[PDB]
Amino acid sequence: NKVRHDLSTLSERDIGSLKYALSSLQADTSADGFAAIASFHGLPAKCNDSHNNEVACCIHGMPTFPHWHRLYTLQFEQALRRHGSSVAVPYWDWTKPIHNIPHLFTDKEYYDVWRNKVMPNPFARGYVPSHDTYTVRDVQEGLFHLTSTGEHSALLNQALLALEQHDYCDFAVQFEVMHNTIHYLVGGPQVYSLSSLHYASYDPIFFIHHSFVDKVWAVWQALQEKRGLPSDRADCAVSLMTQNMRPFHYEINHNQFTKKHAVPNDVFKYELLGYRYDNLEIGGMNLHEIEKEIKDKQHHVRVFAGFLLHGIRTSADVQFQICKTSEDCHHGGQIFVLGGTKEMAWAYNRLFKYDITHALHDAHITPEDVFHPSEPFFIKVSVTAVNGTVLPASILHAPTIIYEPGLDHHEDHHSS
Amino acid sequence: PRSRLIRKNVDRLSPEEMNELRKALALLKEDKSAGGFQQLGAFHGEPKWCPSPEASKKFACCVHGMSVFPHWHRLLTVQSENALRRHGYDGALPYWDWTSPLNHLPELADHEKYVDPEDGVEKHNPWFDGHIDTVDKTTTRSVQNKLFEQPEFGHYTSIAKQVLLALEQDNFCDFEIQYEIAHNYIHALVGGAQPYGMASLRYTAFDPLFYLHHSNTDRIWAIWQALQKYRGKPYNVANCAVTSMREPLQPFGLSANINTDHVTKEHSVPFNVFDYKTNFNYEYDTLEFNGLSISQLNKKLEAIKSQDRFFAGFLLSGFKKSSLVKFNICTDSSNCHPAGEFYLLGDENEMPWAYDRVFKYDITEKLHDLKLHAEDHFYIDYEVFDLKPASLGKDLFKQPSVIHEPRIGHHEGEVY
Amino acid sequence: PRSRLIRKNVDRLSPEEMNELRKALALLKEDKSAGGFQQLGAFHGEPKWCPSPEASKKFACCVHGMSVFPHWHRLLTVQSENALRRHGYDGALPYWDWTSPLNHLPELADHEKYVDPEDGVEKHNPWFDGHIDTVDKTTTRSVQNKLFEQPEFGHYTSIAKQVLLALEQDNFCDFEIQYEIAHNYIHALVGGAQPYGMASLRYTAFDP
């Protein structure tokens, strides 16, 4: 029914359709409409029910999380289709370094038209009617990615690592974190922005970014197929899997396909959605190639940093540094987490690993050498809210230093 | 010199051996020294040594809800054992194999007084109980008779089942969670209602049964390591929580008047604790679970995995720790049936801890009786009660997940 | 540029100067910014910024019972002063010489509303009081009338006596203790009974 293309790939004609569709989307007062559609993600929280007790609708820090957002994108796509969008919503490939913020989203005014009328760009932003606030974005230039390889950006590295994981659960943990980065980048400090859990859904970038993440997640399933394991089946988070995903289950969403799809178990087969992607590729590697690419990574030994993510109450940035037994320390790396008060707290069942290895090497510190005197690796954590003071470390669990045996289950060739 | 002590089952002990224990413990109780019993009891709970003894916020000394947990306890038993040897007890601390069904409580612990033929003077069993100096109270024990042998059939026991599952986990961390909780059951069983007893975290150390139970628990851990050895994984090395293992555990670490034992102090590092025999010259007469041999056990374990199973997962905040939790599966339309129960030991004094991962319980058998399908939707109602009867608000507690662990089809391709 | 501001006694202030203060403070109250009044008030007491704002044990920001005490307060006044100047107040914060006996409270602070000849619109004195956003309450003041001039003879005043003794101390630390306590008297005098006022440490900052 539908193909998804990159934002850059979008032609003017294609974009023009999108431009109009969103405009009409905004107009749609109905529940299917954009204002209503946005609330599904977060505030206002309709999620448990309209009743006062409420939590954020979206599932985060949960394995259901990719399912929900995936479903969420379809809702918009269907909306646009109703609106007459010619194409599926595009995805903003974050992984590649961004010379500049995409024109379609960036331009505040959409001047081009046969009419040559000047209008606001629905893509640029939207406003929150309930809050009567307006969306805002504070972006860091740093997003323009610079890296040694150039190709391997932080997102690329993080995404790739997630990619190499048979375990879905393990995949999701890594998968979600990479996803988090964009919300932080665009939102910045702004309370009302992507950076905020409730507010974020309002920004139209949200759909674009999510399209990409969804695209990547889909690739993972395809990769899994390449691996030969069932893409559909999920080992853990079964409890979560069963639960129907509101508000999709609810009548509020007119969309029929979403309703049946509400169980996240069903969400896995994207094909049921009937939307496809122009190509399934991550950074130039084919699915086949990527599988090949990941195996080589396994050959090398790696050291990991383990994160136990309790979740922070306000959206928060965490910083990591590696310190020598002496005073010296290095910026190990940073990860972002997004969560509102509404978030209805979740915790990661498993450890979130980050590849310390590169940095340690920069340290000219081997995994063998001893980081701290008490236990071999003790590090000082730093956690900050997007705004506000630091959150207490004490609650947080101790750092884990991981050494990883490269051997998976891969033989160069079977016999014939 | 006979340095290597042997831990045997309590039942096994000859009267000569029993007599030695009776005498040794009695002397042990008397020992005023730090090495003495009262002082030793302090390590586990109140009085709380864990931040420096002269010091305000006093939280309990014991690693609970941590991977470190078996290491600390293992050290603790040795500490007691060494003390008895000083007393002149010939053997090692005996282990009460609770897993097996008990016709009755062991006579050694159970009877109030030992009338010994040595002279004929009738003396209260030091084994029976001890008194807490701190609180002017005596340890008490109230145990549910129900623990008495009532197998579904033969060997099958709740403990055996619970322990067995723990045994299956390859990774230590996963093993520990299952492992720890099973450990909790005995405390609850023996202590029962009384506020002063095995039931309470602070009190438990005082009861002499504590050592016997832990000896068994340590024994179980040892078998796990042997099983891991059989598995091919190095028993001593632990993949997870490498960092935590390095840090030493107090009070053993104090290595001062507080801890006389040199052995334990060196041993404080949990990494060291793994190789029990060399470091701690103690052994178990047999490392076996039930009738099964180690190789026997592994084979048996594989059998369980082969079949599909359903589990409920619990995230244990373990905040209102001393309490019993019982959960039952209730049909949508029909009856409820007791799913099973687990116990958490925790005094107010204990420091807060939370499980990184979920604890799994095998729901499957009960559902089968219900003839409930895995697919069918049932609701699990779980109630936690304090040791004293009372209802604790479950609402804050996160709902348990229900997970199905299927065999993947019958994977034709990987294995013939 | 007239950077150097001058602090004068409140009584001294001319109506022109007074008007400037009235306007400036009013704007000052409005200022949402961190620079704004509400934010500035926070420094002294609640909300308690002193361990990092995002943070649990919140103890009050002010140095009290410490030698540091006059330094901190001195900085605080300047902070307010700078704020008013941004508002466009010509002068410096005026000082109410409490040591001298007061026939009555100063008119600037005292009267409820200023009817200014500027246009004739009757406006509540921003000087009179402010409202605490944090607690949904307004600052109040109850003062003992007794403070009114009643000298044993002439100049002799309790405050003068108390201040004088502080003055005598050569060493700063000894000076500070006497100095601080004398300082305390006004808070008590103005605040009196009300829980929201000069009397309470948290509340005091709010009152102008």
Ligand code: CUO
């Ligand atoms: O996660 Cu809910 O927003 Cu991207």
Ligand code: CUO
């Ligand atoms: O564990 Cu601390 O008590 Cu058996």
Ligand code: CUO
């Ligand atoms: O001192 Cu803090 O208040 Cu005048």
